Design a protein around this ligand. Structure first.
Ligand code: HEM
Ligand code: HEM
Lengths: 454, 454
């Protein structure tokens, strides 16, 4: 009942009063983010609450954040909170724990170097052209456009060709066998889990594998097919070459490819939607970005790896968007052993949590946090931003391994789209933007905007 | 179903074919010991089987046994198999794991030194006299005696005064408040657990604490009472003094005292019964032991610590009994990480098992294993006994911490009993002795013998 609910009272840590069995989960009615900001505003730098019986400790002090994410990663704060009915996804790098995660991180780290990324941009760029070609049609109809569907088809085009070498236009090919199987995904089951964490083992024995055994065996056979028939430059080849610590197994290969698919579709499509909202509701910013793009890329020259990393205002626009909308919302680590960090006893089993969304909007570090102002990230003001307040990709050894790939993928899309189109709010546009009430950082209403052709 | 049942086939390890869900548990119909001997006789030095979905690897090679118990204890084979609905018993030394066990083992190790044991023998000896005084009555009735009840009352007399300083004659005081609460214990639930290990978490959330919340709070209040009112020489005082790593908590104190109670009652009473059976069915041995006792202890002098450790034939009789009847039956360790030991890959999560009972009766190391022959442990033949075949108290850092205390407690009882009585088989005596068909090493029928007075 209230088994471990006396933990934060005994340590003298403040926080909302938990209910028996439920803990503080009813306080999620306003959203993960609004709960984090309220607890921040009403308790200060550190507070605690309970996801059911699971005690969660929020910290907002930069030095303590650095200690948890960097200084004591391998020793105390190595793993994230487990775990829904896992299946074979236990071998996924973002799921793996302790030395198995360390093994996977080192086997996959060379795959995300700038050298391998630079070799992926000619393929990624090919679907930027496909993107504008499908945008040209939906724009000439002369009526608002749902960016979630055009960026979604784009994001899937990129991940299918970067993960396996499958080159298909998703929007105009409604059902390639690969496209549909990848679209087979995916509340309130997620809150049932945190309040019934003891029922997770039962889902394993019931053969209730979270992923459909059809799509799972489809990818596992698609990969082993691909393995057989096989100078390719996709994530699969980069992982097959690393098989010739201890090399990756074939099932471990499927697990990582599944992760990248999940990693790319939700994030990049949603962040591209947030950027286009901000660009459309701040026309002066949209114009300055297009003027910069036309400068480095004359007469709509194709963007390359080197020309992308040269665009400073583009990087300022991406970073300021990722401040207002950090899609991960939270950072989490489990405390492996009793530790004292920066004058504070953290007992074993506690989940330490960094409220990224709340920190990106705290008036202590940001002037007028609610306004979209790219000038915060100019070279002049970039220096006074604490890299442990602003953590859109986490930090430390377990930060986002695909950060460079995601920034490069989104910028290549933004450049090609802004070279050809302008974006204005229409009447269906939700202004101001409201965030979804659920447990994901996405717009409450799908972003709809006017698209004109240059 | 057969989720992990393909493990030993993939590694080329032999063993009985498992059934879906059940594994090899139906093969326990003859007993843990008969299953171990059959698998030993039918597979050689190493085999495997499944307790439900849990793979168990048996090993019988002495070098491999030394590597698992001693050489790689801290690194690979530190913990035992978990765990029924545990409750606060997670802080018990025999339940604790990894560094928490190491902490408890070092805090409790000084309590079991020979110095502290030597200070406990005047108290232990007091109830040896109480033992014969209750044996004198049940013998003068002139009819067979159930040793389980006289050794049981003796064993409880010893553990109550050694763990807390409570000095009561249990047999003639049917219900002292302490005696009854300790007697509140304790199939087929145990086999349900191994075939439904995923239902163990549900027993925790249902507040189904394995131990009655009445006796649990009784001891916890009995100890905290004892703590308050308090030159005493019991296990509690030795643990209270150690509170003045990090010192033991009050609830940790209750957890260890509960363990010693469980450790002493079942074992010592049952081993004393086995010894008296063997003494009664081998009168020549019983006479030679009494002749030795009368030599070192003239005219029935009281046994002391130094006079006990001087008796060689007594130690030979105890050791030969513990060979035929090793009450722990098995030794078990969980493999923490992938390891290679003595030319063999042991994957993570496997339970490595030493079949002590089967090794103590293997014709490879023992001539005529089924016969009770104390001469195997004479100084002449003691040298050629491998300390990893004969493991009545385990071995390595996690062996029986109370071995010296148990040997001293049983010998003090044997000496005082043999100074006064002789033991012959009666008609109710089960000859030959049969072992219980369940999952405990105890006689199938209670041992009943004739008792005469010297
Ligand atoms: C806008 C896009 C993205 C954002 C904002 C983002 C952000 C994040 C964040 C905040 C974390 C947690 C880091 C931590 O806990 O400290 C993370 C982890 C991770 N991300 Fe991303 N991510 C993005 C896209 C991607 C992509 C495209 C990939 C791969 C193709 C990827 C792969 C991963 C992996 C594997 C991890 C876990 C690494 C580990 O546990 O060792 N992410 N990401
Ligand atoms: C005839 C009597 C006894 C026998 C044959 C016996 C045998 C054993 C065996 C075989 C083990 C397992 C060792 C291993 O896994 O390697 C063990 C463990 C243990 N025994 Fe005993 N035992 C006896 C009595 C006692 C008594 C009287 C106590 C305490 C008062 C005790 C306390 C313990 C503890 C605490 C452990 C676990 C130690 C740890 O996990 O670190 N035992 N015993």
């Amino acid at each position: 009942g209230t088994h471990s609910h006396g933990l934060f009272k005994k340590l003298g840590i403040p926080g909302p009063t938990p209910l028996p069995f439920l803990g503080n989960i009813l306080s999620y009615h306003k959203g993960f983010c609004m709960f984090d900001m309220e607890c921040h505003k009403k308790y200060g730098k550190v507070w605690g609450f309970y996801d059911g019986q699971q005690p969660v400790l929020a910290i907002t002090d930069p030095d303590m954040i650095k200690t948890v994410l960097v200084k004591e990663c391998y020793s105390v704060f190595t793993n994230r909170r487990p775990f829904g009915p896992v299946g074979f996804m236990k071998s996924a790098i973002s799921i793996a724990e302790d030395e198995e995660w360390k093994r996977l991180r080192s086997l996959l780290s060379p795959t995300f170097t700038s050298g391998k990324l630079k070799e992926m941009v000619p393929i990624i760029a090919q679907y930027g052209d496909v993107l504008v070609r499908n945008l040209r049609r939906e724009a000439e109809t002369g009526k608002p456009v749902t960016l979630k569907d055009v960026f979604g088809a784009y994001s899937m085009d990129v991940i299918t060709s970067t993960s396996f070498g499958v080159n298909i236009d998703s929007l105009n090919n409604p059902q390639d066998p690969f496209v549909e199987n990848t679209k087979k995904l995916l509340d309130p089951f997620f809150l049932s889990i945190t309040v019934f964490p003891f029922l997770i083992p039962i889902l394993e024995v019931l053969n209730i594998c979270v992923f459909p055994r059809e799509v799972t065996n489809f990818l596992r056979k698609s990969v082993k097919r691909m393995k057989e028939s096989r100078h390719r430059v996709d994530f699969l080849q980069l992982m097959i070459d690393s098989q010739n610590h201890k090399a990756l197994s074939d099932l471990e290969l499927v697990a990582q490819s599944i992760i990248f698919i999940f990693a790319g579709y939700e994030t990049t499509s949603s962040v591209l939607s947030f950027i286009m909202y901000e660009l459309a509701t701040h026309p002066d910013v949209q114009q300055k970005l297009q003027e910069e793009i036309d400068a480095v890329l004359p007469n709509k020259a194709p963007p390359t790896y080197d020309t992308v990393l040269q665009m400073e205002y583009l990087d300022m626009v991406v970073n300021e968007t990722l401040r207002l909308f950090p899609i991960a919302m939270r950072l989490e680590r489990v405390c492996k052993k009793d530790v004292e960090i920066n004058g504070m006893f953290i007992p074993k089993g506690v989940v330490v949590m960094i409220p990224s969304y709340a920190l990106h909007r705290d008036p202590k570090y940001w002037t007028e946090p609610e306004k979209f102002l790219p000038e915060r990230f100019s070279k002049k003001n970039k220096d006074n931003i604490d890299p442990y307040i602003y953590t859109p990709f986490g930090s430390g050894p377990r930060n986002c391994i695909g950060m460079r790939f995601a920034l490069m993928n989104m910028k290549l899309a933004l450049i090609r789209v802004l070279q050809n189109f302008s974006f204005k709010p229409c009447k269906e546009t939700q202004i101001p933007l409201k965030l979804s009430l659920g447990g994901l950082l996405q717009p409450e209403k799908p972003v709809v905007l006017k698209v004109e052709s240059r």
